[PDB]
């Protein structure tokens, strides 16, 4: 039948932190920017360092005058985001469509289904500087993709958070 390949990618922050954000300037010449501080991690156990960084106001949510946090404070939200982007891209749809990634995964699968496609196979590789489960996760997205677990693969390759995902779609059918 008709076959289609897809690819997706997402990156999220390792853990949740609080940001001490002072009003900066975009240089007018809506788009807003902040210059924030936070306790960054180090290699030693329980030793943080102070660091600054810049953030688009669109991705931080305040706490209530000068304090914010990141929206994606949660660990598969990074995986599912890249997998929706993979099946969506196979069927030529977009990127993307707020929260509940697993709902976004079910929604992405019904939009390809109206186009008459089903999952043939997916392969998801998570990438982390610091290396669990995953059998729990590949059983859950086999429920939302409505397929066998034998055609859903997750793995985690590390350095001695990020995620790539590829998807293959097989047309609905088929006749003997």
């Amino acid at each position, epitope marked *: 039948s008709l076959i289609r390949i897809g690819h997706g990618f997402d990156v999220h922050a390792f853990g949740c932190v609080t940001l001490n954000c002072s009003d900066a300037k975009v240089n007018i010449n809506r788009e807003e920017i902040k210059n924030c*501080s936070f*306790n960054a991690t180090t290699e030693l156990r*329980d*030793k*943080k*360092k*102070k660091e600054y960084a810049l953030f688009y106001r669109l991705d931080i949510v305040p706490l209530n005058n000068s304090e914010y946090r990141l929206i994606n404070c949660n660990g598969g939200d990074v995986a599912l985001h890249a997998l929706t982007d993979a099946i969506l891209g196979a069927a030529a749809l977009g990127d993307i469509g707020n929260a509940d990634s697993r709902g976004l995964l079910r929604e992405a699968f019904r939009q390809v289904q109206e186009k008459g496609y089903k999952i043939g196979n997916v392969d998801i590789t998570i990438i982390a500087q610091a290396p669990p489960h995953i059998d729990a996760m590949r059983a859950k997205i086999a429920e939302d993709l409505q397929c066998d677990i034998e055609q859903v693969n997750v793995k985690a390759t590390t350095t001695e958070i990020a995620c790539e995902a590829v998807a293959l779609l097989i047309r609905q059918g088929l006749e003997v």
Partner: antibody
Amino acid sequence: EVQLVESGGGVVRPGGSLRLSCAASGFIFENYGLTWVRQVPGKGLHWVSGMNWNGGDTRYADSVRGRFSMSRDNSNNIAYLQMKNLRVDDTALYYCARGTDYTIDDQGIFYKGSGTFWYFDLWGRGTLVTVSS
Amino acid sequence: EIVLTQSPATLSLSPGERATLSCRASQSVHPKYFAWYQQKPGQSPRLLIYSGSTRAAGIADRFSGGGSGIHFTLTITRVEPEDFAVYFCQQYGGSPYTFGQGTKVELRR
């Protein structure tokens, strides 16, 4: 040259007000905490107030709590102390002193660059405040 | 709340002799939340000991600090002429932070 310089002292009448400034040089000012300490010339030291790297942690001595108001500006490396409703008892020589460039919490975590006001390695020369009619 | 009481008020010594200064707290104090200062007439206080027992920069090995609970001590192994001054104990295990009344180490004649 690591240095602290207090200013704004002088004479003020009872019930008056006064505002002391502290001016730093030669180190990353926002990585350190700060403290004010006062001393009558012949007598000993008395802790006044202290604040951490960002002012999120500011505490005062029992005698001045409710009257004094500490603050800082990391963009210019200046710390201030607002003094309101001064008594003759407040007559003394006011020091500005530097805290630490780190801090620790009730769980053992060592935060670098989030200094606090525990001990004091750099001292100013001190500005005299005289409260008399 | 936490009151530091130093003793003795005055400690008369001759160069070479040992100097043992105590600081009694009204309440237990974490052994690593303590500090000692030297001060000279007409100068600003100098830091000697922080974190209970750690010498600061420039402080000779004559100076040693320690203590736990409510008894803390500063020890100068062999006093030299430079060391005659006033010494303050300062705790920072509890708000508000506080100093001792001070101990004057004077030259005995």
